[PDB]
């Protein structure tokens, strides 16, 4: 007798998703506070964060459960890498049109003031920013902190596992009680 609780629930959530039973999926996630966080590979997720391909990581993020601080960290850093690339328009756009940044504006106003100040400076002072703690280390920290919140589950695990129980019954049968 071996036990696992959260994994079973995640299996159920995946089944609900594949079967287009979206509302039950939502209600389940809310009621048990367990979220289905399917990514093709955790390796690919971390690698995507490390390589700085923010489009993909934000696309992936939109499908996920979100601790507010992890999202504001992420979005903040995204804005930083944007202003370093001088993509100021996109940076401002993210500052005003994204939920984590508005929440950041509400709960931590001086911080958002710091971010906008950073966006509006004539050149990117990389020395201060990445001098205290490097870009590689920031992306590493974000990659880990977010990877802890994600899971990889085979495409149709619940049905596959039920198929396995059926094979077990048929070919190894069951103990008498």
């Amino acid at each position: 007798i071996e036990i696992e609780s959260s994994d079973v629930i995640r299996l159920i959530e995946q089944f609900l998703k594949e079967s287009n039973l979206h509302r039950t999926l939502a209600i389940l996630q809310e009621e048990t506070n367990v979220s289905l966080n399917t990514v093709d590979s955790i390796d690919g997720f971390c690698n995507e964060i490390t390589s700085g391909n923010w489009d993909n990581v934000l696309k992936t993020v939109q499908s996920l459960k979100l601790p507010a601080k992890k999202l504001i960290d992420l979005y903040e850093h995204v804005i930083i890498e944007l202003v370093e690339l001088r993509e100021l328009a996109t940076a401002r756009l993210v500052a005003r049109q994204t939920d984590p940044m508005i929440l950041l504006k509400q709960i931590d106003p001086d911080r958002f003031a710091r971010l906008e100040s950073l966006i509006n400076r004539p050149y990117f002072d990389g020395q201060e920013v990445y001098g205290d703690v490097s870009k590689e280390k920031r992306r590493s920290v974000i990659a880990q902190t977010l990877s802890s919140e994600v899971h990889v589950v085979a495409p149709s695990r619940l049905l596959s596992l039920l198929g396995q129980s059926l094979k077990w019954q048929l070919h190894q049968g069951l103990l008498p009680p």
Binding site: D55, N56, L58, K59, L85, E87, T90, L93, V94, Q97
Partner: peptide
């Protein structure tokens, strides 16, 4: 605007 590909894709993903 948005000459970089990752920037365009990020823009479209977030802003549909």
């Amino acid at each position: 605007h948005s000459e970089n590909r990752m920037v365009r894709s990020l823009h479209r993903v977030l802003f549909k």
